[model samples]
Target: PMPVFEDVTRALVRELNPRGDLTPLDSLIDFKHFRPFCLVLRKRKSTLFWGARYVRTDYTLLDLLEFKNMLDVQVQGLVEVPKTVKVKGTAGLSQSSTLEVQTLSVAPSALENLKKERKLSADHSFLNEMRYHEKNLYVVMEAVEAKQEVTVEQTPSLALLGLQKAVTIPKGCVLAYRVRLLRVFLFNLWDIPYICNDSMQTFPKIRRVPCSAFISPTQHEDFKTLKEEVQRETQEVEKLSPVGRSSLLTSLSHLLGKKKELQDLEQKLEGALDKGQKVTLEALPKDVLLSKDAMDAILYFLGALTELTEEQLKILVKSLEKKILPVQLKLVESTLEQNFLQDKEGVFPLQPDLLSSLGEEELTLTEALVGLSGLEVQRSGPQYAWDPDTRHNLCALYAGLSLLHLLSR
Candidate 1:
């Protein structure tokens, strides 16, 4: 049988709390009370995509074989060329079988031909400029079988590839050769983040990655320089005026073209309370109006070409305080009331301290009273940490903020 959530919770609680001092099957421990360590966090957060984001390219044997083939073909051509008179003298010492003078035979024409071949080899000044590449390539293909057994004692990261392997032909490779090939393959290919660094004096400070380079240069460009680059090319953007509770309530009247939607919103909210159903935040306003009309209407209504208001603001404020606040209070009561522990007599009287709290937070036009409130009403306490009652009260404040967001459109 498929195990139920209750069964899973029962099993987990047994394993986690063997003594049964904390686990209560009556409390819905599976979901409702469980929360992140960051209680207020509401967005996606974590390293869930690290494996996908990190570059994990593996060089194949085919790449290695191609590199080897290219080196063999290139080096063979260089070595195959007729030797110059100087090279003939030098190479003879390196490749002779017998040192006896009796076997030595040569003509003037043959010597002349060798000298002509040497002239051809010396003409490649462009190839001479790439002596660095030739040096590295020779070092790379210096096979285990090469006449350098004594030199092959020390092996580098790339040098290990030249060692003997049981694998079939061309199946292993290294990135170093691939990078060299790219230098000759592509012409100035670059990976760039943006067209300009907005903070810098440099208008077009691109995070340029040269494909030819073994490592990208962009790695060395620190954030400070990047920020400076961004600041230089930046333009002034309009600051948005923040919306508050009274202004939000007023915006609803303008959005609905009267008080019709506000009236309907309260009705829907009331219906949810009576039906023993959950009143999700969006239920008060239908999906079509909330999504399609909300964002567009919010921007349109906030700008200069919008409705003017004065008397309507007071009307909206009073209506919300009288009708909406009572409903809000009831909504808060349901959530806060759940946290209380009942005695053997099944009775839990509410506290009267909230009345004093409300009075302490009240404000007026000129010399209004307001100070530290909500989570830390006792100013000496820690700013964020709160008791069960205080946390629920902060949640009630959070609910009010949610309503404020909805009321804005």
Candidate 2:
């Protein structure tokens, strides 16, 4: 059924006139322009159209046709014009005409079908939200649901450590240690705290200590047997001939000088240990240190060392002495063994190198020793050379070697 003009007016009055004022709506209403509401029933399109009581005569037939075309339903023909009515107005009596358009009541089934189609389209298109704008235009939008999946498995950490073995340190590469690693190694070696500050590089808190504190003198079985023989010879000197006595006195004087020489050697070592008083990086030649490229190489090397047994370290040190003197190697070995025995913790494990593969690089014992000595690989071959200034910094190298040796033990 078509909607009545009175009913439409009543709906508009309730929505537009909440204050319940008695002012006439004629001046405020649009009489000519009408939008017909559409309803499709049994596959036929229908419109429910209504308007105000008065329509202005200024509207043209072309405007009516344009308005008809804007409606979703079909318009068969225009209705006969209603009789013109004379209405009293503030200015004077004004003549106005009534407007009528065919309309139908919307079917419940049609609205249900539209709702179903809308839901189906939304589901198919994955649209989750929508909005409307002016002139019955709709703005459609969709938000996707996010989901995350995680999977975990158990694996040995040693597998990661073994990956370091894949890193191949190229032949003739100039190997060096990071300043931090060097500082740490020295700190562990000397049992001294480091002076940490931003303005300067890290150094040991206490630079100089007595050599005796570092290494105690050892007495050999041969030295004890020789002392006993010297005493016997001195007691017999009074009963001997003049020539024998003179020779005996010379031998006694030689033994005394030998004892004084050992004392002098200890003093010299103490002086050497105290000579480079500055414990900062300035004490070592700058070129001997590693750059950023291989800064963690020493750290990896230390990590690898910790995995080995003490016997393995001893064997490794023995094999690395090809270029080192027997006496010097012996001294190094003794120092390391002594320190290891004294160490309550059998081994000092460095923080594992998780980020760097440099530690995983295959390095030979000799190559490592040479690198620690601040010797650089100069040629395409394996030949190594010392920087001219490295000689002056031998004490630092000695400390590093001592640390490395202790780690192996």
Candidate 3:
């Protein structure tokens, strides 16, 4: 009769206790978990489709070959006994043709039992089976009992143990056995609050110079000479009344309006400042300020007042005296002095074109004076150039003076 192997459906515990002890059968055994450790003896390529297809190619042969010999011994039904058996030689080396003849010393009772079962059918056959040499015994024995064959019901649960529903081995593949000795690690993490108290701590702030300020000559010999020249010009202008200062500033403003390169630099510098990136003169390369454009703007502004005619200057002074207040005149003068002196004392060196054109020098002076004044004026009131009352008057005066100067020339 076929053996009825019942499909015992055991209830699986939904919740696993963290503190529970782990056992060999505590987890489910499936092909997914144990597929890598499985041994594949043979695999055949498919003959169909011009041998392009394969039956199986996922076997890890290199790893399986490591234990191939050990698995072969197990597959051959070889049994290993714990204790060693010692035997005596039947004859000395003198009598034997090759060497000493070794024989296995079996118990008299076991010999009697073997004879009763007809295992030792003849004495010569028994002598052939009992031969031993160097801890190896060559034995051939007949089975004492008849072989029994039984069939087992193929259950679906066998699939979970990495077995197939059908027990038949494939043509090219050998039967695989479950060697469940694998372990996997899992982690249980918890969310904990991490507080950093020093996150808001302030760092020491670095002193930064505006892009415009750092590009000019500071400690150079030419800068000192230029500074002396500017101071001399400033003092000469300072001796004049508030009207003279306002007139000078107004003339500077007019000349500055004509310079396209200076205007481009002004827009660029203002953009740099607006971005609020902390940059220093030392941080920038010397080649950046050594360009013709930068040098031209500097030279133009620093010597701009030299371009004005004596008559034009007199006209501007007369017009501005009645238009500007003493305070506004003083503010414009201070602004120009501060900007020019700061540039003279700046950290960046002067460009190589220091000993150059009168027009370029004048342009440089105008930028230093008028650029700063424009900023101050805008800060005070964006609508007015200097003072609310004088703004239009100055603009009209500057325009008329410009036209007149052009006509006279």
Candidate 4:
């Protein structure tokens, strides 16, 4: 059957195996892959494809058809070359260098039904609830001849924590630079609540307004005033630190001000409701509902709250780092005991790598998927158990959200 239009969306997923001849194990023996949907079933084959540029696979496609080194892709886990085998320049290690990709993405809650077992890493963001493309990333399992048959597997997932060297920082001793970095993390995390509250209070209301009603006489004047006020307030709010919210919190204490005057004017077009004013949103002034002013105002509060949150989180992560320092020193000393003596030949697991300790990334999508949330678990992927309950969470997990970005790093 032709793929349905309802299967419509973005991103390219290979219809064939990703692990290059490797076998992937499904959560269960008879599991099927979890894909966003097969919208391109008819369009497959004969060209190169990328999330940014979806193209068909074709022989004459030449250079573009080649999957470049470090390109992320969905592949089977079982066939992924075992990292335990030495690859020059990379230390031969099991699982550490190998990416554990699941074929069929299953949400943790869903896995609960497939088996009456337990998993330690439940509630993880990349577990099963993110978009499939968001979770897909290619690993260095390297090129191999394709040949495989395995019934157990699921769809791809954006895996890897960028837990290793994804970010690089230069040597610095200045407090200002340090403060900026810390603030970055905090500011990102602080955006969590700002966006949540904005959508709950702002987006819904704005969405309810009719698109064409912006030009009404009553709506036009109201919007002009609202835009002016929102713009000014937005600028003010953007500058506010959460610490400075005493002023912002005071100003925005109400959704919109000059309430008494506005309420009296509501008499002209407030009849759509059985009781209270019908939101009279349809009669709203042109440009009021969809104007950049409205969005900026919302963003201003978000940006302001984010800065404030960073101020607080700076103290928190810093404090946690201090607490771990003593144990860190002691742990390093224990390694000294092992190295000085007749000990194991290989490197220690605890030894830090510049990239990993700094930030980890096998690919960019790996960084992106672990980054968002708060929406329903409409799809499944790795890092989760395969049960029936696809988890639903507040999108607070990510969305270029201020707070989520900070805390994640």
What is the alpha-carbon lDDT of model 3 when measured against the actual structure? 0.24
3 or 4, greater by TM-score: 4
TM per prediction: 0.18, 0.14, 0.15, 0.17
lDDT, model 4, position 210: 57
Candidate 3 lDDT, tens digit per residue, 303-382? 23223323323333333333322323333333333333231112222222321222432323322222221221222122
lDDT of each: 0.24, 0.25, 0.24, 0.22
Residue-level error in angstroms, candidate 2, position 283: 24
The model with the greater lDDT, 3 or 4, is 3
Candidate 3 TM-score over all chains jointly: 0.15
In Å, residue 67's CA in model 1 sits off its true spot by 40
- For candidate 2, list the clashing residue pairs, or say none: 164-360
Error of 4 at 132 (Å): 29
Which of the two, 1 or 3, has more lDDT?
Answer: 3
- Candidate 2, after superposition: displacement of residue 381 in Å? 3.5
Q: What tens digits encode model 1's per-residue C-alpha lDDT throughout 33-80?
A: 111110111111101100000111122112212122122211111111
